[PDB]
């Protein structure tokens, strides 16, 4: 009878949401909230099913019923709300370019070898021998880095091997709500001395969204998380829409949290939290349909993906 | 922004103002009803000096030339404005190729236009080398360019920077440009620099000469082959094994090889002495097509956060073509 009786070993919120989901035997048809999805093989269904579970369960874009561009005005409001301006960034010095109009340092950053003005050197205080580590005042705002989004690295440098990342999602209902939420959240995070990166939708036409703001908290996530949740809890329900993803932990209306995936397997990497969880659910649902028993296929596939099936916002 | 300087040239040319039926670009009717394409480049202004060096030579060209270009109506180089006659019912070659209308015939007309272009006084022309590939970026991106790119683009740059074989091959390709017979070369060709009039049924126009130089003719040949390479191995496809993506991609290329072969026949019709003067033209063109692949993957990565497996695979095809141009030249039919 109970949603949890029939779906044992799985978080109740995912048990409840799977009642809205069925896969036909053979796995060439599926239905998610009466969004019907068909395909010519199980394998083609896996990605069509993965996408629907993502849209329906993670994003909240529903389609089973009868029913891009950077904006400089918003980029300005979002960039104005950033308390800091600079993130010290370590790389290895490759070469010192002695140009009279301004010396430049070719530095191997983790993601790219870059040519940086010498005036951005922090440590050491004079350009070292090539091969030596340097530290650089690199801008914290990165408006092009993440398409659709305005991105900021926090003042404080991130752990060398970053390690686990706590993702916090804010369901901003509009751009004005985003700027307030963005400001609030960066405040708290910098006050709490958080090691983080964050981003916010930079196209006004793309709200509302449950990941309209995303915070990436590294190291010790509890100070930043507490700080963030106190700084926005006042706006939860009003500036944030109330619904959040079934895969996440709800901290307040429209404020959810999770962890970056930690999937054991090679080739099942570089996925977002939402797509990773949806793919594993589709894989377990598909596997079910290719043979209570459904809940075990699902628990199995989540576990093989490194997801805690009692707590799918987290990883084993 | 740049509307003042554009409305001032149109006024001084007798074209009135831009009607609301239309760096930055503008196309459509003027208050006088003349169809104009307004191009703006932020400034002197060397891209416009190159554009103009083409419009001088293009004036000395019959309307029976396989190489047709929109008439220049005017220009203010110091403000970075050019105006040309809009091609009636303009359909770009990118649109055409996406709809399967960039056929073998149209590829032959492109080669004839490009073959024609390379045979046309070379005195007014820029002999500076085109920064393509960007060799300094292979060592190190400017910090300000890093802050204007996506994570996928940045990742695509680092993969090339860390690939010594490719970096070396590109330095040699650019080094070889001063050891070959140069020709008037477009230097930045893509399917979108080719326009048909009459909504896809009309004649062929080659446009965008902001990179026009006296240069290695392989740049243009390779660019055209490179577009078919990128179309066949990437565009037509955008959860599979990498070996499957390469297999599907290799078969798409093979089915697209006649497009390249046709271009090259067109090319040789109008430039029959190309290999008598440059035996290594096929090989250098293959290497340029190989780079062109990276260039096009890096550009498309603009709106991506990761490099998907199709892009990773497509890249791997370009490394093969760039590191093996001779064989690629034979595979591609530029022999
Ligand atoms: Na095609």
XYZ file of C-alpha atoms and ligand atoms in Angstrom:
652
model
C 0.000 0.000 0.000
C 2.548 2.611 1.234
C 4.868 4.302 -1.391
C 7.803 3.261 0.874
C 6.381 -0.259 1.424
C 6.558 -0.946 -2.308
C 9.828 0.929 -2.782
C 11.967 -0.340 0.096
C 15.616 0.665 0.450
C 15.069 3.951 -1.399
C 14.569 7.481 -0.054
C 10.818 8.126 0.360
C 10.947 11.223 -1.889
C 12.351 9.036 -4.721
C 9.929 6.257 -3.841
C 7.029 8.710 -4.184
C 8.349 10.168 -7.479
C 8.785 6.685 -9.083
C 5.026 6.112 -8.693
C 4.786 8.670 -11.533
C 7.159 6.499 -13.632
C 6.695 3.225 -15.512
C 8.751 1.453 -18.168
C 7.063 -1.005 -20.540
C 8.487 -4.575 -20.564
C 11.196 -4.785 -23.214
C 12.144 -1.144 -22.412
C 11.077 0.471 -25.699
C 8.402 2.612 -24.022
C 8.387 4.598 -20.789
C 6.075 7.140 -19.115
C 7.227 9.887 -16.648
C 4.323 11.945 -15.212
C 2.388 10.979 -18.370
C 5.187 12.357 -20.553
C 5.408 9.364 -22.914
C 8.787 8.352 -24.366
C 9.422 5.641 -26.979
C 12.485 4.245 -28.756
C 13.615 1.505 -31.138
C 15.912 -0.166 -28.568
C 16.469 -0.286 -24.766
C 19.667 1.707 -25.263
C 17.891 4.533 -27.088
C 15.258 4.566 -24.320
C 18.035 4.900 -21.669
C 18.902 8.395 -22.890
C 15.328 9.451 -23.708
C 14.300 8.151 -20.254
C 17.358 9.783 -18.609
C 16.317 13.126 -20.176
C 12.662 12.910 -19.042
C 13.558 11.911 -15.459
C 15.929 14.851 -15.511
C 13.362 17.340 -16.798
C 10.423 16.001 -14.797
C 12.177 15.106 -11.483
C 15.228 17.350 -11.341
C 14.373 20.505 -13.301
C 10.587 20.549 -12.816
C 9.856 21.189 -16.486
C 6.660 19.141 -16.949
C 5.303 18.218 -20.414
C 3.048 15.152 -19.993
C -0.285 17.011 -20.001
C -2.351 19.157 -22.377
C 0.250 21.965 -22.002
C 20.971 31.453 -24.444
C 22.230 35.072 -24.529
C 24.224 36.994 -21.873
C 22.361 40.103 -20.708
C 24.762 43.009 -19.879
C 22.305 44.795 -17.591
C 21.922 41.628 -15.536
C 25.665 40.780 -15.786
C 26.278 44.236 -14.315
C 23.838 43.762 -11.419
C 25.245 40.257 -10.730
C 28.854 41.492 -11.048
C 28.139 44.521 -8.817
C 26.837 42.162 -6.066
C 30.184 40.329 -5.751
C 31.971 41.515 -2.515
C 35.477 40.549 -3.678
C 37.273 41.051 -7.020
C 40.323 38.771 -6.941
C 41.225 35.122 -6.384
C 44.905 34.231 -5.816
C 45.682 31.465 -8.268
C 48.763 29.248 -8.229
C 50.487 27.967 -11.361
C 54.012 27.024 -12.501
C 56.027 29.760 -14.228
C 57.102 28.732 -17.713
C 58.739 31.925 -18.874
C 59.091 35.631 -18.044
C 58.366 37.724 -21.133
C 60.506 40.861 -20.924
C 58.497 43.361 -22.967
C 59.230 47.072 -22.309
C 55.521 47.962 -22.492
C 54.912 45.498 -19.643
C 56.551 42.253 -18.572
C 54.291 39.204 -18.881
C 54.353 35.778 -17.243
C 53.520 32.607 -19.255
C 52.170 30.432 -16.430
C 50.809 26.884 -16.587
C 47.551 27.226 -14.704
C 45.725 23.958 -13.916
C 43.298 24.449 -16.849
C 45.504 26.290 -19.388
C 48.842 27.912 -20.008
C 48.119 31.654 -19.893
C 50.005 34.870 -20.544
C 49.412 37.099 -17.521
C 50.665 40.683 -16.806
C 53.592 40.571 -14.357
C 51.723 43.123 -12.125
C 49.420 40.291 -10.992
C 52.236 38.339 -9.277
C 51.694 38.012 -5.510
C 54.080 35.223 -4.455
C 56.923 35.314 -4.875
C 57.201 39.129 -4.992
C 59.715 39.055 -7.900
C 59.314 36.659 -10.879
C 60.988 33.334 -9.879
C 63.086 30.941 -11.954
C 61.060 29.251 -14.690
C 59.700 25.963 -13.249
C 58.887 27.580 -9.917
C 55.377 28.075 -8.523
C 53.886 31.558 -8.755
C 50.670 32.995 -7.318
C 48.537 35.499 -9.198
C 45.722 37.956 -8.600
C 43.332 36.616 -11.207
C 39.816 38.060 -11.546
C 37.122 36.224 -9.557
C 34.324 37.016 -12.001
C 34.223 34.696 -15.040
C 31.125 35.669 -17.146
C 31.899 33.460 -20.176
C 33.239 30.405 -18.326
C 29.910 28.633 -17.888
C 27.472 29.260 -20.774
C 24.085 30.592 -19.595
C 25.601 31.661 -16.257
C 27.660 34.269 -14.458
C 30.434 32.515 -12.585
C 32.573 33.625 -9.643
C 35.405 31.998 -7.768
C 35.576 32.931 -4.072
C 38.285 35.135 -2.569
C 39.846 32.157 -0.851
C 41.717 29.590 -2.904
C 40.181 26.082 -3.157
C 41.802 22.885 -1.743
C 44.703 21.688 -3.974
C 42.935 18.357 -4.754
C 39.447 19.951 -4.449
C 37.848 16.821 -2.972
C 34.139 16.617 -2.178
C 31.952 19.555 -3.386
C 28.672 20.490 -1.653
C 26.298 21.903 -4.280
C 23.578 24.298 -3.044
C 20.750 25.144 -5.476
C 18.554 28.267 -5.187
C 15.280 28.259 -7.196
C 15.246 31.961 -8.066
C 11.879 32.900 -9.590
C 13.290 35.843 -11.590
C 16.396 37.938 -12.259
C 15.590 40.512 -9.553
C 15.245 37.636 -7.047
C 18.527 36.184 -8.369
C 20.507 39.431 -7.804
C 19.167 39.642 -4.224
C 19.816 35.925 -3.630
C 23.197 36.113 -5.334
C 24.224 39.120 -3.187
C 22.931 37.504 0.006
C 24.671 34.205 -0.661
C 28.086 35.608 -1.673
C 28.007 37.856 1.438
C 27.467 34.894 3.795
C 29.967 32.678 1.996
C 32.743 35.283 2.105
C 31.826 36.176 5.735
C 31.844 32.459 6.642
C 35.304 32.202 5.049
C 33.970 29.659 2.531
C 36.123 27.911 -0.087
C 33.762 28.114 -3.046
C 32.814 28.862 -6.637
C 29.297 29.947 -7.536
C 27.200 30.864 -10.536
C 23.862 32.391 -11.413
C 21.749 32.465 -14.604
C 22.771 35.498 -16.695
C 19.848 35.321 -19.182
C 16.676 36.814 -17.610
C 14.429 34.780 -19.978
C 15.625 31.486 -18.436
C 14.117 31.979 -14.946
C 12.476 30.395 -13.195
C 14.922 27.517 -12.567
C 15.789 25.348 -9.533
C 19.540 25.762 -10.244
C 19.174 29.460 -11.036
C 21.929 29.909 -8.468
C 24.427 27.183 -7.737
C 27.038 27.308 -4.979
C 29.984 24.932 -4.945
C 31.302 24.673 -1.392
C 34.577 22.869 -0.897
C 36.463 21.804 2.232
C 34.260 22.290 5.222
C 30.810 22.908 3.864
C 28.890 23.384 7.151
C 29.917 27.036 7.954
C 29.148 28.244 4.388
C 26.005 26.128 4.196
C 24.746 27.440 7.585
C 25.653 30.997 6.601
C 23.944 30.655 3.237
C 20.818 29.023 4.707
C 20.456 31.818 7.319
C 21.118 34.583 4.750
C 18.384 33.380 2.351
C 15.906 31.496 4.625
C 14.219 34.891 4.948
C 13.601 34.900 1.152
C 12.643 31.220 0.848
C 9.182 30.869 -0.742
C 9.152 34.523 -1.926
C 12.310 35.070 -3.978
C 12.745 31.292 -4.410
C 9.938 29.111 -5.832
C 9.004 26.346 -3.322
C 9.699 23.144 -5.305
C 13.087 21.478 -5.395
C 14.555 18.356 -7.060
C 13.590 14.896 -5.708
C 17.305 13.960 -5.821
C 18.340 16.800 -3.509
C 17.975 17.520 0.226
C 15.644 20.467 0.892
C 17.076 23.089 3.299
C 14.203 25.592 2.792
C 11.505 26.198 0.129
C 13.510 26.379 -3.117
C 16.902 25.873 -1.412
C 18.311 22.373 -1.986
C 21.708 20.718 -1.485
C 23.658 17.715 -2.772
C 27.196 16.513 -3.563
C 29.087 16.339 -6.876
C 28.969 12.670 -8.084
C 31.810 10.331 -7.100
C 31.145 7.582 -9.643
C 33.710 4.709 -9.433
C 33.523 3.756 -13.122
C 35.644 5.202 -15.991
C 33.580 6.653 -18.846
C 30.660 7.512 -16.514
C 32.287 10.853 -15.628
C 31.891 14.595 -16.243
C 28.110 14.392 -15.583
C 26.193 16.955 -13.516
C 24.509 15.825 -10.269
C 21.040 15.880 -11.858
C 22.032 13.983 -15.037
C 24.080 11.414 -13.026
C 21.142 10.575 -10.721
C 18.669 10.482 -13.643
C 20.925 8.213 -15.751
C 21.297 5.751 -12.832
C 17.516 5.765 -12.216
C 16.849 5.178 -15.949
C 19.475 2.393 -16.000
C 17.849 0.666 -12.985
C 14.340 1.183 -14.371
C 15.478 -0.089 -17.800
C 17.172 -3.125 -16.221
C 13.957 -3.912 -14.316
C 11.959 -3.791 -17.579
C 14.534 -6.065 -19.350
C 13.891 -8.878 -16.800
C 9.564 -4.348 -4.875
C 11.769 -6.049 -7.497
C 11.716 -2.741 -9.377
C 12.930 -0.921 -6.301
C 15.885 -3.392 -6.081
C 16.930 -2.812 -9.707
C 16.848 0.932 -8.902
C 18.736 0.604 -5.612
C 21.264 -1.577 -7.403
C 21.871 0.866 -10.264
C 22.162 3.897 -7.923
C 24.653 1.954 -5.743
C 26.713 0.984 -8.807
C 26.715 4.713 -9.683
C 28.092 5.560 -6.192
C 24.765 7.057 -5.057
C 23.387 6.423 -1.588
C 19.870 5.096 -2.394
C 18.565 6.053 1.046
C 20.024 9.553 0.559
C 20.614 10.145 -3.172
C 21.797 13.727 -2.629
C 24.937 11.954 -1.267
C 27.516 9.443 -2.443
C 28.757 6.157 -0.963
C 26.788 52.021 -30.047
C 28.018 52.335 -33.649
C 24.686 53.467 -35.198
C 25.887 57.141 -35.600
C 28.867 56.222 -37.797
C 26.733 53.826 -39.882
C 23.881 56.300 -40.494
C 26.482 58.967 -41.451
C 28.021 56.838 -44.260
C 24.600 55.774 -45.590
C 23.561 59.465 -45.654
C 26.748 60.553 -47.466
C 26.209 57.731 -49.972
C 22.564 58.661 -50.774
C 21.200 55.505 -49.082
C 19.177 57.416 -46.463
C 18.943 55.591 -43.156
C 18.522 51.964 -42.099
C 14.787 51.090 -41.861
C 13.620 49.019 -38.840
C 13.163 46.065 -41.242
C 16.849 45.086 -40.703
C 31.574 43.566 -34.097
C 27.977 44.258 -35.277
C 26.209 43.748 -38.626
C 22.997 44.908 -40.328
C 21.174 43.746 -43.459
C 17.930 44.930 -45.046
C 16.215 47.855 -46.759
C 17.278 51.514 -46.619
C 14.803 54.427 -46.393
C 15.623 54.669 -50.136
C 14.725 50.969 -50.504
C 18.213 49.788 -51.501
C 19.134 46.460 -49.864
C 22.457 46.875 -48.058
C 24.686 44.742 -45.837
C 26.312 46.955 -43.182
C 29.450 45.505 -41.578
C 31.167 47.119 -38.587
C 34.701 46.336 -37.338
C 36.080 48.050 -34.209
C 39.070 50.196 -35.265
C 43.423 52.466 -38.240
C 41.302 49.450 -39.226
C 43.317 46.647 -40.976
C 40.468 44.165 -41.643
C 38.754 46.914 -43.682
C 42.047 47.759 -45.427
C 42.166 44.058 -46.413
C 38.492 44.060 -47.436
C 39.189 47.120 -49.598
C 42.350 45.622 -51.147
C 39.983 42.874 -52.365
C 37.289 45.296 -53.686
C 39.931 47.063 -55.822
C 40.922 43.781 -57.592
C 37.300 42.529 -57.707
C 36.375 45.655 -59.705
C 38.712 44.415 -62.489
C 36.550 41.227 -62.788
C 33.913 40.242 -65.409
C 30.399 39.178 -64.340
C 31.421 35.907 -66.061
C 34.110 35.262 -63.384
C 33.458 32.082 -61.338
C 34.399 34.482 -58.501
C 31.519 36.844 -57.692
C 31.430 39.286 -54.765
C 28.753 41.791 -53.599
C 29.409 45.299 -54.857
C 30.949 47.715 -52.364
C 28.703 50.753 -51.982
C 31.054 52.563 -49.621
C 33.219 52.537 -46.513
C 34.549 54.723 -43.712
C 37.695 52.814 -42.664
C 38.486 55.157 -39.750
C 35.086 54.344 -38.195
C 35.253 50.683 -39.250
C 32.101 50.793 -41.425
C 31.653 49.094 -44.768
C 28.440 48.932 -46.843
C 27.801 46.447 -49.657
C 24.861 45.544 -51.855
C 22.830 42.832 -50.160
C 22.636 39.661 -52.241
C 18.899 39.148 -53.059
C 17.511 36.132 -51.196
C 20.907 35.340 -49.646
C 21.337 31.770 -48.400
C 24.670 31.084 -46.685
C 26.601 27.887 -47.351
C 26.246 26.888 -43.737
C 22.431 26.826 -44.112
C 22.789 24.966 -47.443
C 25.130 22.279 -46.037
C 22.809 21.814 -43.029
C 19.949 21.226 -45.518
C 21.981 18.970 -47.861
C 21.872 21.594 -50.645
C 25.682 22.178 -50.646
C 26.095 19.617 -53.437
C 29.021 18.441 -55.532
C 28.132 21.019 -58.208
C 28.138 23.890 -55.784
C 31.479 22.621 -54.360
C 32.914 22.731 -57.922
C 31.745 26.365 -58.308
C 33.425 27.147 -54.974
C 36.733 25.682 -56.208
C 36.428 27.636 -59.468
C 35.809 30.843 -57.476
C 38.745 30.032 -55.180
C 40.919 28.849 -58.082
C 40.064 32.095 -59.884
C 40.804 34.145 -56.769
C 44.330 32.670 -56.431
C 45.238 33.582 -60.045
C 44.185 37.232 -59.621
C 47.889 42.812 -59.426
C 49.203 41.564 -56.024
C 50.762 44.941 -55.160
C 48.094 46.467 -52.889
C 47.882 43.396 -50.599
C 48.737 42.674 -46.993
C 51.751 40.295 -46.827
C 51.514 39.998 -43.067
C 50.922 36.428 -41.970
C 47.399 35.525 -40.890
C 47.419 34.529 -37.194
C 45.686 31.218 -38.076
C 46.695 29.007 -36.501
C 47.431 31.419 -33.553
C 50.976 30.282 -32.712
C 51.430 32.404 -29.523
C 48.170 30.899 -28.170
C 49.669 27.407 -28.670
C 52.268 28.517 -26.137
C 49.976 30.626 -23.907
C 46.528 32.224 -24.197
C 46.371 35.950 -23.333
C 44.781 36.222 -19.907
C 42.103 38.542 -21.325
C 41.154 35.857 -23.900
C 40.845 33.235 -21.178
C 38.276 35.509 -19.493
C 36.161 35.587 -22.688
C 36.003 31.835 -23.287
C 34.033 28.855 -21.990
C 35.452 26.013 -19.854
C 35.180 23.712 -22.841
C 37.076 26.168 -25.034
C 39.700 26.570 -22.338
C 39.956 22.742 -22.100
C 40.201 22.459 -25.892
C 43.031 25.042 -25.868
C 44.962 23.218 -23.102
C 44.709 19.890 -24.930
C 46.344 21.482 -28.020
C 48.926 23.399 -25.964
C 49.944 20.106 -24.272
C 50.152 18.273 -27.639
C 53.765 18.952 -28.697
C 53.424 17.011 -31.928
C 50.495 19.205 -33.033
C 52.082 22.446 -31.838
C 55.250 21.565 -33.767
C 53.281 20.610 -36.884
C 51.461 23.964 -36.792
C 54.737 25.924 -36.427
C 56.110 24.095 -39.487
C 52.894 24.750 -41.505
C 53.102 28.456 -40.766
C 56.903 28.475 -41.357
C 56.366 26.934 -44.802
C 54.179 29.873 -45.947
C 57.262 31.986 -46.718
C 58.851 29.182 -48.793
C 55.956 28.702 -51.255
C 54.469 30.768 -54.119
C 51.868 33.059 -52.569
C 48.451 33.957 -54.007
C 45.598 36.385 -53.190
C 43.936 34.308 -50.515
C 40.784 34.770 -48.504
C 42.475 33.184 -45.387
C 39.291 32.674 -43.235
C 37.004 30.516 -45.366
C 34.012 28.658 -43.933
C 30.742 27.534 -45.592
C 29.183 30.756 -44.259
C 31.543 32.922 -46.403
C 29.764 31.371 -49.440
C 26.360 32.874 -50.366
C 23.836 31.840 -53.033
C 21.323 34.395 -54.244
C 17.619 33.655 -54.973
C 17.038 31.680 -51.755
C 19.468 28.867 -52.674
C 18.807 28.714 -56.455
C 20.937 31.756 -57.461
C 24.635 32.352 -58.237
C 27.535 31.886 -55.773
C 29.183 34.777 -53.925
C 32.339 34.720 -51.768
C 32.243 37.337 -48.944
C 34.072 38.570 -45.776
C 37.562 39.603 -47.050
C 38.747 41.084 -43.693
C 41.630 38.548 -43.738
C 42.456 38.880 -47.460
C 46.245 38.698 -47.926
C 48.952 37.543 -50.239
C 49.227 34.134 -48.584
C 49.602 30.391 -48.956
C 46.791 29.131 -51.277
C 46.671 26.013 -49.098
C 44.913 28.090 -46.438
C 41.778 28.289 -48.580
C 41.926 24.819 -50.039
C 42.494 23.309 -46.569
C 39.769 25.558 -45.114
C 37.217 24.220 -47.609
C 38.247 20.587 -47.049
C 38.307 21.315 -43.282
C 34.672 22.451 -43.341
C 33.597 19.172 -44.951
C 35.746 17.278 -42.418
C 34.088 19.130 -39.543
C 30.620 18.848 -41.078
C 30.971 15.092 -41.720
C 32.576 14.185 -38.387
C 30.807 16.635 -36.076
C 27.993 18.822 -37.401
C 25.812 15.915 -38.638
C 25.952 14.324 -35.137
C 25.360 17.457 -33.040
C 25.911 7.448 -25.054
C 28.200 5.488 -27.428
C 31.686 3.892 -27.417
C 34.548 6.041 -28.783
C 35.286 3.379 -31.395
C 31.662 3.672 -32.587
C 31.896 7.479 -32.849
C 35.098 7.135 -34.935
C 33.499 4.463 -37.115
C 30.327 6.512 -37.682
C 32.511 9.554 -38.243
C 34.880 7.819 -40.710
C 31.883 6.640 -42.783
C 30.326 10.142 -42.812
C 33.648 11.552 -44.107
C 33.903 8.914 -46.849
C 30.343 9.801 -47.971
C 31.387 13.472 -47.960
C 34.744 13.027 -49.833
C 33.112 13.757 -53.270
C 32.327 17.258 -51.968
C 36.047 17.911 -51.446
C 36.958 16.188 -54.730
C 34.542 18.426 -56.640
C 35.932 21.607 -55.049
C 39.437 20.488 -56.042
C 38.388 19.753 -59.621
C 36.710 23.164 -59.749
C 39.874 24.635 -58.264
C 42.176 23.057 -60.864
C 39.836 23.972 -63.772
C 40.502 27.638 -62.945
C 44.078 27.206 -61.591
C 45.647 24.410 -63.693
C 49.239 25.368 -62.752
C 48.831 25.088 -58.951
C 50.833 21.858 -58.518
C 53.367 22.710 -61.249
C 54.246 25.642 -58.985
C 53.518 23.915 -55.610
C 53.838 20.120 -55.421
C 53.257 20.298 -51.661
C 50.081 22.261 -52.015
C 47.848 19.160 -51.392
C 49.833 18.289 -48.287
C 49.790 21.810 -46.790
C 46.099 22.099 -47.532
C 45.494 18.786 -45.748
C 47.396 20.133 -42.726
C 45.282 23.344 -42.818
C 42.098 21.231 -42.976
C 43.430 19.404 -39.901
C 43.934 22.676 -37.997
C 40.594 23.947 -39.393
C 38.994 21.058 -37.495
C 40.395 22.253 -34.188
C 39.507 25.815 -34.978
C 35.873 24.848 -35.651
C 35.654 22.538 -32.602
C 37.090 25.222 -30.322
C 34.606 27.771 -31.736
C 31.542 25.520 -31.267
C 32.733 24.716 -27.726
C 31.809 28.374 -27.012
C 28.392 27.334 -25.760
C 29.595 24.158 -23.941
C 30.948 23.444 -20.460
C 32.506 20.097 -21.391
C 33.982 18.594 -24.537
C 31.547 15.837 -25.534
C 32.921 12.540 -27.016
C 32.009 13.543 -30.621
C 34.188 16.650 -30.321
C 36.952 14.587 -28.687
C 36.750 12.089 -31.550
C 36.495 14.768 -34.268
C 39.587 16.401 -32.787
C 41.372 13.061 -33.061
C 40.586 12.999 -36.820
C 42.233 16.434 -37.246
C 45.392 15.363 -35.398
C 45.530 12.440 -37.868
C 45.095 14.791 -40.870
C 47.552 17.421 -39.531
C 50.204 14.833 -38.520
C 49.526 12.862 -41.745
C 48.675 15.520 -44.402
C 50.293 13.561 -47.297
C 48.043 10.511 -46.676
C 45.140 12.825 -45.743
C 45.657 14.630 -49.055
C 45.189 11.304 -50.855
C 42.273 10.212 -48.687
C 40.647 13.665 -49.212
C 41.202 13.662 -53.004
C 43.493 16.679 -53.211
C 46.227 14.651 -54.960
Na 26.095 16.216 -45.110
